[PDB]
Amino acid sequence: HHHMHIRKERPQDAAEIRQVTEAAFRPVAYSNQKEGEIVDALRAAKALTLSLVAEEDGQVLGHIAFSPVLIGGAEKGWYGLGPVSVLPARQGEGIGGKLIREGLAQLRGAGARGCVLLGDLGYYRRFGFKAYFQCLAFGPDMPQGDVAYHAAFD
Ligand SMILES: CC(=O)SCCNC(=O)CCNC(=O)[C@H](O)C(C)(C)COP(=O)(O)OP(=O)(O)OC[C@H]1O[C@@H](n2cnc3c(N)ncnc32)[C@H](O)[C@@H]1OP(=O)(O)O
């Protein structure tokens, strides 16, 4: 019962998810510390498409959010990945990678057409993202058009 496992969030997790998110982003120099707010706003708007936690000994160690993105104003089965957050002390152990791979697998399994993200130049290549935006297509390549994240992201 000391094993880490990944599962979908439940309503009872909201405070802890936000605590982990805010801890992860607190020292991030370009962060305006809105990532916790964003997750909660996505949830409030029913736009938190997928929300997974990594849990061990009843504690949330990490979290990932996915939400729909519009392309040229249209819903085309594309999602944005983020935020993803792991407790600072438990980073560099593969938790983030496990959350990302599992989240992508669940999106694909539910009929998604692709995922986009903004982030580190090289890290996300291990999940198939290719290069602003990085993109992972589950079928045809990403259709052209302005990418808009949900209003929660501002
Ligand atoms: C799209 C977005 O959401 S961008 C915003 C991302 N989130 C943040 O910036 C918040 C602060 N940062 C974090 O919370 C974390 O650093 C995250 C979520 C980005 C990554 O979570 P982690 O659990 O540390 O991810 P993970 O362990 O899979 O990989 C991190 C690095 O540790 C390395 N690593 C992990 N496990 C091992 C291991 N057993 N041996 C050697 N290296 C390892 C990884 O290769 C990676 O380094 P690399 O990019 O040079 O290859």
Side-chain angles (χ1 to χ4, degrees), residues 10-45:
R10 50 201 302 272
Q12 293 77 9
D13 297 324
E16 191 162 352
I17 287 168
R18 182 155 176 169
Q19 179 190 350
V20 171
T21 300
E22 291 178 347
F25 282 90
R26 194 166 300 116
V28 173
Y30 42 88
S31 167
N32 290 293
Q33 313 296 296
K34 298 295 185 68
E35 294 81 10
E37 292 189 27
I38 291 167
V39 171
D40 287 3
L42 290 170
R43 193 185 292 107

Side-chain angles (χ1 to χ4, degrees), residues 24-25 28 30 81-87 90-98 117-120 123-124 126:
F25 282 90
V28 173
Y30 42 88
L81 186 163
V84 55
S85 306
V86 171
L87 282 176
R90 294 295 294 269
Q91 290 169 3
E93 304 175 3
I95 299 172
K98 289 172 184 162
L117 63 80
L118 293 169
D120 182 77
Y123 175 72
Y124 302 94
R126 72 197 61 199

Side-chain angles (χ1 to χ4, degrees), residues 56-131 133-146:
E56 188 182 282
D57 291 321
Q59 179 181 224
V60 175
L61 301 185
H63 171 258
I64 186 167
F66 297 83
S67 56
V69 299
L70 298 178
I71 299 170
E75 303 174 333
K76 306 186 70 58
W78 281 75
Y79 297 86
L81 186 163
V84 55
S85 306
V86 171
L87 282 176
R90 294 295 294 269
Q91 290 169 3
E93 304 175 3
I95 299 172
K98 289 172 184 162
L99 283 166
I100 294 163
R101 288 194 185 83
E102 182 58 28
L104 294 171
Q106 290 192 33
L107 280 184
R108 190 189 289 266
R113 295 273 282 187
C115 193
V116 299
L117 63 80
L118 293 169
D120 182 77
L121 182 74
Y123 175 72
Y124 302 94
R125 292 175 53 92
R126 72 197 61 199
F127 319 107
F129 287 89
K130 298 188 298 179
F133 296 110
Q134 305 180 40
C135 297
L136 170 60
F138 298 141
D141 287 299
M142 195 180 174
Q144 291 286 300
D146 291 347

